[PDB]
Every structure is written in structure tokens, then in C-alpha cells.
């Protein structure tokens, strides 16, 4: 009167849970949304050949919730669904090697993801969630569908939406081990005196307002709260890299003075990112396309620099 097969369910592909399913009910009626080898089988009834196979499901009990938390480092019950929704699209993208880096061929307004992925491959960073570390290793090998889908899911963005590199890195850095990173700034006003500040973690590696790391060390003019103008400069830096960002204008990149950079062009509300990396010369990676030149000038928005330990000699 009820026929069954044995299957395995999982939210992480590591902890497998035996389930006996009724062959007259769909997987969705028994599990909720269900996937077999990436394929959506929610509307399907079980087949004899499915016996023994592993199905991804969403976490709808305490056991699966704890396992999702330990793998993704999220308590949001919608995370896996939104990740699977992104993954439906990113699994169709192509991820060619371009000058030895995994890129992404243009699809679905994904240029900001391409330059973020290329950047992550050139700065020293360790991700805390096992799912993000695991997917990053796979991305490095040219299978970046899981990693891109996770990026979208951790930024709560959907495929096709406009992405911003600065916001994207900020979300990802929040899931990286940047706790030891340290930054000390000093701000001097001719009338108010000087004020020092110490930043840790993500705030210690990102700055908004200047693209030049060397200008940041020499001092930048910023509005002072007294209404006058003041000079802010970097006193100390402890981090494996720094990310310098600014509202775009026209900026010149020169070989050997930076690690990599992002350029933003086209319609501002739905624009296009290109990646520039410094190797033996400058390479402009534009999705699957490659060009090379001695220098590069354009609307740069983010520049990444290598760092270890810096202390100023100023004052």
C-alpha cells in the first residue's frame, strides 16, 4: 500500500541523513524544495534509480539548521534557497582562465563579480565559513559557480542587479579573518588641534576618498567638523593588503605600483566593471577578454595594494 526507497538528504554535502520516501508523493510534498545533482526535482515523484542518491534540501528542522549554521555561518532560514536561486544562473556561466586567474565571461550584468573574483585571487585572505572557503578553492580551479552564488547570497543580491565592488568586498571581508588588522590615523586641523583614531578588522583595510596609498601616507584634505579643512594621514598599518576606494574620476595606473584595480564605465545606474592587474605589465581583464599595456588611465574606483607592516616617519 506504500512503496518506498531510501535516499540521503543534506544541506552541506558533508552530513548525510537517511530518509525513507513514499514513491507516490513528490519530493516537495515530503521535503520542501529538493535538488538532485543540481537539478530541481521538487515536482518529481521518486524513481527506483534514485535509491541511495543524495539530495540537497532546505533546513526545516533543528538538526539541519545547526548544520547550515556551521557550514555557511548564517542564521537566515532563506539563505540556502537564495543561494540555490543564484546558483541556477551562475552554474550556466563560463569561468575561463585569463592570465592564470579565474575570470567570468560576461553574463547577466556580472562584471562586478568578475573583478571581485579576480581581486580575491591576488590578495591574502582566509574566509571563515567552510562553505565560502571550499567554494573559493573550487573557484580558483575554474569552477566558480558555487562561489559566485554564495557572494550574491551573502550580499543578499540577486543575479542581474547592479553590483558595487566596494560594497561586495565589504560583505566578503566581514566573513574573512581580518581581526588582527590594525590601522592608526591622525587628523590635524590648524585651529582644532589633532585627533588620532584606531581602526580594527574590516575598517582597518578599507578607505573611501583616495585611490593612492602613497597620498594616504602623505595626507589628504578632508572636511573638518569645525567647518574648516583638515589633513588626515596614515600613521600605522598592519594588514596583508589595503583597499583604497574613491568616487571615480580619471586616474592613471602605472606598472608595479599597485596589485590590482577596478574601473567602472558605461551607464552609471547599470554600469560595467573592468579589472586591471599589474604583472610584468598591466593587463586589462574584461570578463573573457584580455588586453595589455604599459599604463592605464580611466575611471578607477578601487585599487588594492600589498602590505605587511607600515609605520610613518611623519612628524
Q: Which does 108 bind (CB under 5 to 8 A by kind): its own copies, Zn ion, none?
A: none
Nearest to 111 by CA among 292, 288, 304: 288
Tell which one of 225, 257, 281, 311 touches its own copies (CB under 8 A): 225
Q: Is 24 in the site for its own copies (CB under 8 A)?
A: no
d(CA 4, CA 122): 50
d(CA 308, CA 267): 37
d(CA 86, CA 73): 18
Using the contact rule CB under 8 A, the part of the chain among 67-75, 95-103, 130-138, 143-151 near its own copies is 67-75
Length of the chain: 315
Tell which one of 14, 16, 162, 192 touches Zn ion (CB under 5 A): 192
Q: Is 162 in the site for its own copies (CB under 8 A)?
A: no
Q: Is 249 in the site for its own copies (CB under 8 A)?
A: yes
Using the contact rule CB under 8 A, the part of the chain among 14-22, 99-107, 136-144, 234-242 near its own copies is 14-22
What does the DSSP 8-state code read for residue 74?
Answer: -
What residues numbered 205-264 form the site for Zn ion, per CB under 5 A? 224, 226, 228
Tell which one of 70, 108, 143, 238 touches its own copies (CB under 8 A): 70
Shortest Å distance, C-beta 160 to its own copies: 14
Nearest to 122 by CA among 291, 304, 253, 284: 304
Secondary structure of residue 200 in the 3-state scheme: strand
Pairing of strands 54-57, 4-10: parallel
Tell which one of 5, 36, 53, 65 touches its own copies (CB under 8 A): 65
Q: What are the CA-CA distances from residue 177 to residues 181, 216, 231, 252, 257 (Å)?
A: 9, 24, 31, 32, 26
> Which residues contact its own copies by CB under 8 A?
14-16, 26, 28-33, 40, 42-43, 58-59, 62-63, 65-70, 75-78, 81, 156, 189, 191-201, 208-210, 220-227, 229, 246-249, 268-269, 301
Amino acid at each position: 500500500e506504500v512503496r518506498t526507497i531510501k535516499v540521503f538528504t543534506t544541506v552541506d554535502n558533508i552530513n548525510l541523513h537517511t530518509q525513507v520516501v513514499d514513491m507516490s508523493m513528490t519530493y516537495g510534498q515530503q521535503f520542501g524544495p529538493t535538488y538532485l545533482d543540481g537539478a530541481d526535482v521538487t515536482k518529481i515523484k521518486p524513481h527506483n534509480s534514485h535509491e541511495g542518491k543524495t539530495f540537497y534540501v532546505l533546513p526545516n528542522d533543528d538538526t539541519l539548521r545547526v548544520e547550515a549554521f556551521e557550514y555557511y555561518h548564517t542564521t537566515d532560514p532563506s539563505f540556502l534557497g537564495r543561494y540555490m536561486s543564484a546558483l541556477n544562473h551562475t552554474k550556466k556561466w563560463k569561468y575561463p582562465q585569463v592570465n592564470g586567474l579565474t575570470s567570468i565571461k560576461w553574463a547577466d550584468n556580472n562584471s562586478y563579480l568578475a573583478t571581485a573574483l579576480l581581486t580575491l585571487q591576488q590578495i591574502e585572505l582566509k574566509f571563515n565559513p567552510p562553505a565560502l572557503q571550499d567554494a573559493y578553492y573550487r573557484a580558483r580551479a575554474g569552477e566558480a559557480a558555487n562561489f559566485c552564488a554564495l557572494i550574491l547570497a551573502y550580499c543578499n543580491k540577486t543575479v542581474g542587479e547592479l553590483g558595487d565592488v566596494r560594497e561586495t568586498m565589504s560583505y566578503l571581508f566581514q566573513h574573512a579573518n581580518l581581526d588582527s588588522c590594525k590601522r592608526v590615523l591622525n587628523v590635524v586641523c590648524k585651529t582644532c588641534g589633532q585627533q588620532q583614531t584606531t581602526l580594527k578588522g574590516v575598517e582597518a583595510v578599507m578607505y573611501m576618498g583616495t585611490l593612492s596609498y602613497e597620498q594616504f601616507k602623505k595626507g589628504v584634505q578632508i572636511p573638518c567638523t569645525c567647518g574648516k579643512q583638515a589633513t588626515k594621514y596614515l600613521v600605522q598599518q598592519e594588514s596583508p593588503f589595503v583597499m583604497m576606494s574613491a568616487p571615480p574620476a580619471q586616474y592613471e595606473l602605472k606598472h608595479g605600483t599597485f596589485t590590482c584595480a577596478s574601473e567602472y564605465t558605461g551607464n552609471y545606474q547599470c554600469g560595467h566593471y573592468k579589472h586591471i592587474t599589474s604583472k610584468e605589465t598591466l593587463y586589462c581583464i574584461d570578463g573573457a577578454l584580455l588586453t595589455k599595456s604599459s599604463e592605464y588611465k580611466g575611471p578607477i574606483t578601487d585599487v588594492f595594494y600589498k602590505e605587511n607592516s607600515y609605520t610613518t616617519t611623519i612628524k
